[PDB]
Structure formats: structure tokens, C-alpha cells
Design a protein around this ligand. Structure first.
Ligand code: PML
Length: 239
């Protein structure tokens, strides 16, 4: 008997915060209390609690590494190199980089979902190409434990969330992911794949730059099951 808890908050019409937790009824209040207090300030908040029908547990099996470079250019070139080791060929991967660099949303600014890409035409397969695909319905099977472990190991709370997200993205047949934050104060991002693991890369963008986002690399041959798994399948993740 599990429940999905999905929170979103705004201030002056602009999104300020969001989170999902998947927990037993006995933890339902704890999760709702955590998400209620998450935003610093807000005008409006919606919390959507939904009982889970089907779900699957998966064990986390990615290896984490971290690399630091002197410049966004050095960092982005290294991201391209490590994508290359996931079978992506250098050309597609470098298109992903400028998209997030130049501005992922066509009409300008940041999408709040991911770019889809085939590993060949390098074109954006996402439906609403101004919002993109949002991966949802995933969580750490024991978030409090995992968060303690990874924070002690030196990672941040953003790592904790980003890890669980990619491992679902990859479990759903995304082959590799490119991501950095749109927060202008957080310049660590990552490249991710079933072979390269979770490769954290720092300065993927200049401080003060407010353009971020994700790009998922996928087989257009498979796009149907992936969007299904990304947006509808319910996955807990244990260590
Ligand atoms: O593991 C990290 O520290 C990198 C997480 C990238 C930031 C994800 C985001 O805020 O969109």
C-alpha cells in the first residue's frame, strides 16, 4: 500500500519548488510535512496524493565519479568525450550541449522537462518542445537512509535527487543523459549512462548563467515504451 505525494509551489506565477515522495501510509504525514516546508516562500502550493497501483523495486547499480575543470569549455568537452563512450557519436552529443547552453526552450529560457534526442538525427523528439518530458513516479525506497549516506560521503541534496532520477531514466531505456542545473549558483552537472555510470562534472556553466536543463538520448525505435515508463511507471530504488 504505497502513496505518491507530488508537490508544486509558485511565487508570483513562477514555479519555485517541486518534489515527489513515494511512501507507506504510515509515512504519508512525514512526507507531506517535508514537502509543505520545502519552499522558502510561496504564493500557492498544490499537493497531490495518489495511491499506487503497480510498482517495481530496482537495485541501484551505477558507479559515481566526480571531475573538476578550470572552465565550462573544458568541462563541456569532457562531457562530450564521456557521452562518446556510451556509443553516442561526438556530433549528437555536442548538439545537446549548445541547446542547453544557448537556451533549451525554443521561445527562450528553460524548459521544465527534458529534451529527447535520437542517437542519430540529433533532432528534438519531445512532444511539447517548450516543456519536454518530465520523468516522475520514482523515489528512493529509503530516502532518509540514502540521504544520510550520500551527504556523509560529501555529496549534496541535489545529487540525491539527481541520482534517483537518472537511474529511473536509464531503467526506462534512456541510454545516456546530459544535465546541468538552471540555478545560477550551482554549476555542477553530470553525464550518465549504464556503462560510464553517474559522472559528475563541475563548471558545466558559468556562475550567474541561469540556463539549465536535461537531454535524454534515446532510440527513436523505442520512443513509445520509454515515454510510457518515464511518465507512468512507478519505481522505487534501493541500494
Ligand atoms: O550530483 C550533483 O551534484 C549534480 C546534480 C546536478 C543538478 C541537478 C539539477 O538541479 O537540475
Amino acid at each position: 500500500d504505497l502513496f505518491s505525494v507530488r508537490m508544486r509551489a509558485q511565487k508570483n506565477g513562477k514555479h519555485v519548488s517541486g518534489a515527489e515522495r513515494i511512501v507507506k501510509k504510515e509515512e504519508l504525514e512525514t512526507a507531506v510535512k517535508e514537502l509543505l516546508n520545502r519552499p522558502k516562500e510561496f504564493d500557492f502550493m498544490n499537493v497531490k496524493v495518489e495511491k499506487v497501483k503497480d510498482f517495481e523495486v530496482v537495485k541501484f547499480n551505477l558507479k559515481i565519479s566526480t571531475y573538476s575543470f578550470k572552465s565550462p569549455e573544458e568541462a563541456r568537452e569532457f562531457a562530450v568525450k564521456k557521452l562518446t563512450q556510451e556509443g553516442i557519436k561526438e556530433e549528437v552529443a555536442k548538439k545537446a550541449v549548445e541547446i542547453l547552453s544557448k537556451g533549451a526552450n525554443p521561445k527562450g529560457g528553460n524548459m521544465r522537462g527534458a529534451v529527447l534526442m535520437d542517437i542519430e538525427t540529433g533532432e528534438r523528439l519531445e512532444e511539447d518542445k517548450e516543456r519536454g518530458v518530465r520523468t516522475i513516479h520514482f523515489d528512493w525506497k529509503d530516502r532518509k537512509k540514502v540521504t544520510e549516506k550520500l551527504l556523509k560521503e560529501g555529496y549534496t541534496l541535489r545529487t540525491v535527487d539527481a541520482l534517483a532520477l537518472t537511474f529511473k531514466n536509464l531503467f526506462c531505456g534512456v541510454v545516456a543523459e546530459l544535465c546541468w542545473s538552471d540555478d545560477p549558483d550551482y554549476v555542477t552537472g553530470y553525464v550518465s549512462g549504464k556503462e560510464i555510470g553517474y559522472v559528475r562534472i563541475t563548471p558545466l556553466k558559468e556562475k550567474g548563467d541561469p540556463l539549465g536543463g536535461r537531454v535524454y538520448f534515446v532510440s527513436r525505435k523505442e520512443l513509445s515504451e520509454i515515454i510510457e515508463c518515464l511518465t507512468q511507471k512507478v519505481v522505487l530504488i534501493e541500494l
